Amino acid sequence: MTESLVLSPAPAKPKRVKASRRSASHPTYSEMIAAAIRAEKSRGGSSRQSIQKYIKSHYKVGHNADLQIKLSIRRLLAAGVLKQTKGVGASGSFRLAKSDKAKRSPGKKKKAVRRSTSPKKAARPRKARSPAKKPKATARKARKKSRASPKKAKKPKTV
Amino acid sequence: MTESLVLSPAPAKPKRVKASRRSASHPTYSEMIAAAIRAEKSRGGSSRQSIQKYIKSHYKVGHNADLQIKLSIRRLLAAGVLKQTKGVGASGSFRLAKSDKAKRSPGKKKKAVRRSTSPKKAARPRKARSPAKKPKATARKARKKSRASPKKAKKPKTVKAKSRKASKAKKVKRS
Amino acid sequence: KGLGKGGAKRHRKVLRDNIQGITKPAIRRLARRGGVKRISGLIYEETRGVLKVFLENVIRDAVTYTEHAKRKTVTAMDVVYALKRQGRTLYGFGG
Amino acid sequence: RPGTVALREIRRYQKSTELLIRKLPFQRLVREIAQDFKTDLRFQSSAVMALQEASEAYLVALFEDTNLCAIHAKRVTIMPKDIQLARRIRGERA
Amino acid sequence: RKSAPATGGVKKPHRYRPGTVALREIRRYQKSTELLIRKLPFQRLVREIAQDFKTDLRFQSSAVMALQEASEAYLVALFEDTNLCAIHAKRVTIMPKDIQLARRIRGERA
The interaxial angle of helices D80-90 and E96-105, nearest 10 deg, is 70
- Asked if the Cβ–Cβ distance from B78 to A24 is below 8 Å, we say no
Nearest Cα to Cα of residue C73 among C81, C83, C63, C82:
C63
The CA-based dihedral angle spanning residues B158, B159, B165, B171, taken in that order and rounded to the nearest 10 degrees: -70
Q: Phi and psi (nearest 5°) for D77?
A: -95, 155
- Asked if the Cβ–Cβ distance from B79 to A96 is below 8 Å, we say no
Kindly list the partner chains of chain D, i.e. chains with 3 or more CB atom pairs below 8 Å. C, E
Is residue C45 a part of any domain in this protein? Answer: yes
d(CA E1, CA E54): 57
Query: Among positive and negative, which fits the CA dihedral C12, C16, C19, C21?
Result: positive
Q: How many residues does chain E have?
A: 110
d(CA C29, CA D13): 8
Confirm if C37 and D3 have CB atoms less than 8 A apart. Answer: yes
Containing structural domain, residue C68: 12-95
Nearest chain A residue to E9 by CA distance is A1
- Asked if the Cβ–Cβ distance from C76 to D50 is below 8 Å, we say yes
Q: Phi and psi (nearest 5°) for C73?
A: -100, 130
Q: Phi and psi (nearest 5°) for D80?
A: -60, -20
d(CA A35, CA A60): 13
d(CA E98, CA E86): 6
d(CA D89, CA E84): 8
CB-CB neighbors (< 8 A) of E8 in chain A:
1
Q: Is E103 on the interface with D (CB under 8 A)?
A: no
Is residue E46 a part of any domain in this protein? Answer: yes
Cα separations in angstroms, B94 against B53, B64, C39 = 14, 20, 60
- One-letter amino acid identity for E58? R
SS3 content of chain C, % helix, strand, coil (to 5): 50, 0, 50
Q: Is E97 on the interface with D (CB under 8 A)?
A: yes
Is residue C58 a part of any domain in this protein? Answer: yes
- One-letter amino acid identity for B136? K
Measured CA angle at B153 (ends B151, B156), to 5 deg: 90
d(CA A14, CA A58): 9
Interface B:C, ≥3 CB–CB pairs < 8 Å:
no
d(CA A80, CA A98): 14
How many domains are contained in chain D?
1
- Asked if the Cβ–Cβ distance from C34 to D66 is below 8 Å, we say yes
- DSSP code per residue over chain B: --SSGGGSSGGGTHHHHS--SSS--PPPHHHHHHHHHHH---SS---HHHHHHHHTSSS-STTTHHHHHHHHHHHHHHHT--B----SSSS---B---S--SS--TT-------SSSHHHHHHHHHHHTS---SSSSSHHHHHH-SS--HHHHHTTT-S---TTSS--HHHHHH-
Q: Is D65 on the interface with E (CB under 8 A)?
A: yes
Confirm if B45 and B73 have CB atoms less than 8 A apart. Answer: no
DSSP count for chain C of H helices, then E strands: 3, 0
How many domains are contained in chain C?
1
Which CATH number do you get for residue E41? 1.10.20.10
What letter would DSSP give residue D71?
H
3-state secondary structure C4-37: CCCCCCCCCCCCCCCCCCCCHHHHHHHHHHCCCC
Q: How far is A3 from chain E (nearest CA, A)?
A: 8
d(CA B160, CA E62): 96
Nearest CB to D89 within list E89, E97, E106: E106
The set of residues, in sequence order, having a beta carbon less than 8 Å from that of C7 and lying 6+ positions away, is: C1
The CA-based dihedral angle spanning residues B88, B91, B94, B99, taken in that order and rounded to the nearest 10 degrees: -60
The helix/strand/coil state of D42 is strand
Task: Judge residue B76's burial from the number of C-beta atoms within 10 Å of its C-beta, 0-12 exposed, 13-18 middle, 19 or more buried.
Answer: buried
- Number of neighbours of residue E68 by Cβ within 10 angstroms: 19
d(CA B43, CA C95): 96
The set of residues, in sequence order, having a beta carbon less than 8 Å from that of B26 and lying 6+ positions away, is: B17, B18, B19, B32, B58, B59, B60
CB-CB neighbors (< 8 A) of D7 in chain C:
37
- Asked if the Cβ–Cβ distance from C36 to D66 is below 8 Å, we say yes
Cα separations in angstroms, B23 against B80, B90, B120, B143 = 32, 36, 11, 8
- Asked if the Cβ–Cβ distance from B81 to A103 is below 8 Å, we say no
d(CA B171, CA C15): 97
Mutate: best of E79, E84, E87, E101, partner D, most D CBs <10 A: E101
Confirm if C72 and D42 have CB atoms less than 8 A apart. Answer: yes
Kindly list the partner chains of chain E, i.e. chains with 3 or more CB atom pairs below 8 Å. A, D
Nearest chain C residue to D8 by CA distance is C32
Containing structural domain, residue D33: 1-94
Is residue C6 a part of any domain in this protein? Answer: no
- Asked if the Cβ–Cβ distance from B76 to A99 is below 8 Å, we say yes
Confirm if E101 and D68 have CB atoms less than 8 A apart. Answer: yes
Interface D:A, ≥3 CB–CB pairs < 8 Å:
no
Question: Per DSSP, what are the bridge partners of residue D42?
Answer: C73
The helix/strand/coil state of C38 is strand
- Number of neighbours of residue D47 by Cβ within 10 angstroms: 21
Nearest CB to B115 within list A24, A76, A98: A24
Kindly list the partner chains of chain B, i.e. chains with 3 or more CB atom pairs below 8 Å. A
Cα separations in angstroms, B88 against B41, B47, B62, B161, E46 = 19, 11, 26, 52, 62
What letter would DSSP give residue C69?
T
Resolution for this PDB entry, in angstroms: 3.6
Q: Is A2 on the interface with E (CB under 8 A)?
A: yes
Mutate: best of E2, E3, E10, partner A, most A CBs <10 A: E10
Task: Judge residue A138's burial from the number of C-beta atoms within 10 Å of its C-beta, 0-12 exposed, 13-18 middle, 19 or more buried.
Answer: buried
User: Could you tell me how many CB contacts below 8 A there are between chain D and chain E?
Assistant: 34
CB-CB neighbors (< 8 A) of B98 in chain A:
34
Is residue C50 a part of any domain in this protein? Answer: yes
B20 alpha carbon, distance to own chain's centre: 16
Q: Phi and psi (nearest 5°) for B62?
A: -60, -20
d(CA B54, CA B40): 8
Q: Is A102 on the interface with E (CB under 8 A)?
A: no
Nearest CB to C35 within list D10, D34, D47: D10
Q: Which helix (H) or strand (E) holds E74?
A: helix E61-86
Is residue E82 a part of any domain in this protein? Answer: yes
Q: How far is D25 from chain E (nearest CA, A)?
A: 30
- Asked if the Cβ–Cβ distance from A38 to B116 is below 8 Å, we say yes
Nearest CB to C23 within list D6, D21, D53: D21
- DSSP code per residue over chain A: -TTTSTTTTTTTTTTTT-S--SSS----SSSSHHHHHHS---SS-B-HHHHHHHH-SSS---SSHHHHHHHHHHHHHHHT-------SSSS--B----SSS-S---S---------HHHHHTTHHHHHSTT--S--SBTHHHHHTS---HHHHHHHHH-
Is residue C64 a part of any domain in this protein? Answer: yes
d(CA D85, CA D93): 9
CA distance between the termini of chain B: 54
CB-CB neighbors (< 8 A) of E10 in chain A:
2
Is residue C92 a part of any domain in this protein? Answer: yes
CA distance between the termini of chain E: 52
- Asked if the Cβ–Cβ distance from C93 to D34 is below 8 Å, we say no
Nearest chain A residue to E12 by CA distance is A2
Confirm if C28 and C47 have CB atoms less than 8 A apart. Answer: no
Nearest chain A residue to E4 by CA distance is A1
Which CATH number do you get for residue C44? 1.10.20.10
Nearest Cα to Cα of residue D62 among E98, E76, C49, E94:
C49
